[PDB]
Amino acid sequence: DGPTMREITETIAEAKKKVLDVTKEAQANLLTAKHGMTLRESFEDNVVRFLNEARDKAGRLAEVNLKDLNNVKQMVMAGSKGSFINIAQMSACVGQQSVEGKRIAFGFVDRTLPHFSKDDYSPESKGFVENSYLRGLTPQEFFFHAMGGREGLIDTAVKTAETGYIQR
Amino acid sequence: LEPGHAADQEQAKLIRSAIEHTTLKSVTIASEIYYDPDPRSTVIPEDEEIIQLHLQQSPWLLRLELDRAAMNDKDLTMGQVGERIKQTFKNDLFVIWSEDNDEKLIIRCRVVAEEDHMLKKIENTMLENITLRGVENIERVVMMK
Amino acid sequence: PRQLHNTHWGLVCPAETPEGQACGLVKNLSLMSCISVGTDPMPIITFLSEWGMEPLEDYVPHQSPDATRVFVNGVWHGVHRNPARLMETLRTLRRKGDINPEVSMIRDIREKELKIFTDAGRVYRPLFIVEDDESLGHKELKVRKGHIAKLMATEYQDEYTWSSLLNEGLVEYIDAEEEESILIAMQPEDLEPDVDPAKRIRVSHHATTFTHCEIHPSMILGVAASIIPFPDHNQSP
Amino acid sequence: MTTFRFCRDCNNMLYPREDKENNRLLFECRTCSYVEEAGSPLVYRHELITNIGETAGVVQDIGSDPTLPRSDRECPKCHSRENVFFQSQQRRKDTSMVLFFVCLSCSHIFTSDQKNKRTQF
Amino acid sequence: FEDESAPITAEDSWAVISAFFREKGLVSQQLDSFNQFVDYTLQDIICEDSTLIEISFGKIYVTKPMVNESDGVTHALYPQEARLRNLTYSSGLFVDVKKRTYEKVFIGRLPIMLRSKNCYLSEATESDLYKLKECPFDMGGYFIINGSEKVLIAQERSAGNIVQVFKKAAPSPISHVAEIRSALEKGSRFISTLQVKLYGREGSSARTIKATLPYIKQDIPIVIIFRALGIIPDGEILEHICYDVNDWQMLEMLKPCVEDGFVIQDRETALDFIGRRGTALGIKKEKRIQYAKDILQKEFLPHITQLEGFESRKAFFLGYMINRLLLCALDRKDQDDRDHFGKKRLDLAGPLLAQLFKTLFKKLTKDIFRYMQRTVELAINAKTITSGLKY
Ligand SMILES: [Zn+2]
Ligand SMILES: [Zn+2]
After folding, report:
1. Which residues of A touch D62 (CB under 8 A)?
2. In CATH, which of 1.10.1060.10, 3.90.1070.20, 3.40.250.10, 3.40.640.10 is domain C38-119?
3. Which chain C residue has its CA at the smallest distance from A125's CA?
4. Which residue among B50, B114, C14, C46 has the highest number of C-beta atoms inside a 10 angstrom radius?
């Protein structure tokens, strides 16, 4: 729905504002870590919770709004295929990408790609994909989602190989 | 935690700080060696007060400056720190230090003939191989409810 | 070595890699990447010292501490005290062909280093150049419509060429190491200063310093992934 | 805060020596017989929590570096609003996320650090 | 009339990309590299070891493509017939040889890349490609060897001539190392690794720095290497390393190094220290000193210079590397990212075939000094090159 989309986009707008304050806050040195956890690790932990919790609300939004005749929903309700995350990523928002448990890292110096300026910790800059698949990804998000993906394809071959030897 | 006191957030901190391994290193802002030859007064304006408290000794002086936050974030006294240092070194090193109210935390040590090597190794022993509180091997400890 | 590196943006495809053992070690060049063939450095070396580079044998750091170290294929040849002058000239020269286009030149401003590489095997890609000014207000792409028409006249006659575009300083090739010192716009419209609810969200130009712009973002893909329709609407695996 | 001294004759390094009798600090050379009296009594410092290097990179041309973000903060000295800014350039796990700003008219450096113990940088 | 100065828009990109592909096509990486091999690298492989102990090779010409026949003999070869006949779309190579006293000419077959400047197809029109039975959409960039189409796959490696620093994990007695793989465009492709190592982990006692030079069987204290190069006083040695007199932290880290080199106070001694670590007992001093010099002049940072006056240049560069190692040990700079693709190089046809035809022209040039070390008094094996290529 149009109305559901506007709610999803506001849901997302509010998480990015949460992030912006927790930013400004660490930037003025007012944030505390707590106990053996570095400042930057506390920062990250928080921004990722915000951004996940956004994904999820945005996804609950979409699920709700779909009708019983919605055939995606009919498959999910029957149990025959698909789950919430799939509704969510298709229709509301795909979300934070990650490589080794963390946001996309600064592989150029102090930046994730040359289209960004240095020292940028914002959602966009480190891998939040705000768009759903229906809407499509931008180029930057597209590349970070492929970073992520790639890590599953490798992880998957290593699992398969590791598991097979254990099994024997 | 022990059956009574297992919903004391404060008795859990205590238990955290009796177990979490703590070295001088983790509380110490900077160490310095000064040539301060006369062990009854001092080239250091600030420790006039600390010396001023004393009802053999090296002219080379090692002097550490400790962090108030970290010292209380691990429920540490100067007294305990000094006591720790001392029974590590014993008669082989002479140590005095700033009392608790004192505003800055200072430890100042001297030996008891070539005498600055000993000091920079001695300093390394300080900073790494002196267990202040806690148990070996245990690096962080976290509360969770 | 298996993982998709940020630095492979625009040079190797982020999608095409085999499954299994070769995953991530076999790659495919992006549609527009190229690889240097190598080019001899001696006229650049000569040029530098015509332009003030001071030789290592004279260098006394305690007496010129602000100095920029100048390296060519990995050799520290000396030190220069206005690397901004030197750098504006070097690039002008590569934008006109007097330095070969596939030479890479990086100044690192805060590291006080200027590194140049004329060796084979470096992979690169082309970008539009963005220059203040104009006269007309903002930063703008150096190519403009009149260039495009010359191009399309040429296509239709089947003489202004890709090389004409290099020669006139409109386009320039950049490698991964030089990529670190620029700022690129994703679409030409990020240079000019009520949306469609069904469009995707784009996060605007908070940027007045672009030096370059992509030609087109779909050129990060290689051959195979350039045949998928709508890849941007698909889960990446 | 050590400053480091060299022999006037050899340019080799000087080492400390106590003048046992008059209770004073000398630096001697191990290569000549040169000696000189000490400037301070501090012969060694070890910073465990250091700030040396937060500001590395600040250079006459910092403002021509297109990669640096810019802001409209005003500075304490010139009251100008042309800055570039960056995080701490120490490369620690245990760094704050504070910003350092560089005024592009008067070259003054300042921070967004609201617990600033720093004078210098 | 539309303004010629107007700004472009997104659609207008395709015009620019069309233009790139009309010029470059899709496999220019292949072609550009073979073209440069044929046109420049070939001839440069002949002008390295041109001379022997006399006889010295000059120019090369490259035939168009051709075959040694079964009977009725030597013939222009198009790529359709090589495919079909299990042929090898090859051209031959002719050098310009000289005898001179002190006490044309075929040398081979070069497999030639399709659509290179040398292959027939690169000039051909669309009609010409249909007469020759070659699809006008084929794009080139591979070889036909024994009738099979063969492509060489780009090989990714690190670049050489780059300093890289690394931490080393936990049980190691060194904590960081800085490493370069020194190399040559002119010379050979001979690959010395200098490593610069910082001994002792974070707060060990005297952390020291030592370098590993080639043939020298002990790590050498960096100050001794500075002395063998001519930079004697602690003060000059420290100023090639720490280019900032108020960095008291860097300097305090270079004190143990000053202590570790204190015994060696002049160049001769320094060389000797080195030279003995390279020579057996028995070797006389002057010979030891000279061993050391030759190591340093030839096998230490040879990307810099391998010739005689060039010691300040190496000194500085060793300095720089120790600066890099320290800036990392002092936690100012992160350890180098071994995956940054800009520090990689991908090796294509030309380079791959020069690794080979160097190696082989160096065998062929060794069989020439054996028509000649056993000549008690135009007699060359062509094939060794031909078939090493093809093989
Ligand atoms: Zn002296
Ligand atoms: Zn100002």
Report:
1. none
2. 3.90.1070.20
3. C203
4. C14
